[PDB]
Ligand binder design. Structure first.
Ligand code: 0Q4
Lengths: 99, 99
């Protein structure tokens, strides 16, 4: 679908079998999801943003559905104020910025 | 144009008579530009992101050119690690997300 930006670009995602709402973020290299239990092996990582760095748990090759489109890649789980879908998964579903 | 997300979506912007590179961020509600001596009246504000909040100076009715497209709105100036063009300005150049 073509998404305008008058409102935050929020979409429904399915992760670990459960439904969540996330923000399509072109300014995020990675995908960061709020703290949750996810079946899998993880490794600690640190990511940075506008206010600084946060510790996250890195999960590889996770199957996630973003607005009905399937993607399989890295998902970081930690104390983010909001769930964000970064470029790593957006490229998988073929998202582009147009104007 | 159509911008793919393999790399960070950076564009050239013109502000206060200066040319710089900025990141098109659909996950940013506001526009944040690196510290610069802009003339005019401003008001203190604190903006947050991943990691926390930073103090910025809010300037209204700022004329900016994003990739050859003129826009006008609020611009926050502060110690940001990178210039960020948010939704407030992206909606003015008719930018959309498509997948
Ligand atoms: C796996 C670890 C290695 C990789 C790791 N990578 C990074 O750290 C890379 C550079 N970081 C990023 O790409 C991060 C997102 C996290 C991530 O993708 O990892 N991007 C970001 O954090 C980008 C800005 C940015 C871009 C590049 C560099 C620096 C900063 N901001 C994303 C962010 C999303 C928002 C929904 C929380 N937006 C904002 O921070 C904007 N804020 C807003 O729009 C607020 N008004 C909303 C706040 C919500 N309200 C509330 N809490 N009451 C701000 C720019 C005006 C590293 N380098 O350590």
């Amino acid at each position: 679908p073509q998404i305008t930006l008058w409102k935050r670009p929020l979409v429904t995602i399915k992760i670990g079998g459960q439904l969540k709402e996330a923000l399509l973020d072109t300014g995020a290299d990675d995908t960061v999801i709020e703290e949750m239990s996810l079946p899998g092996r993880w490794k600690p990582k640190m990511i940075g943003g506008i206010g600084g760095f946060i510790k996250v748990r890195q999960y590889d090759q996770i199957i996630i559905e973003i607005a009905g489109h399937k993607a399989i890649g890295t998902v970081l789980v930690g104390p983010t104020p909001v769930n964000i879908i970064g470029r790593n998964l957006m490229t998988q579903i073929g998202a582009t910025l147009n104007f």
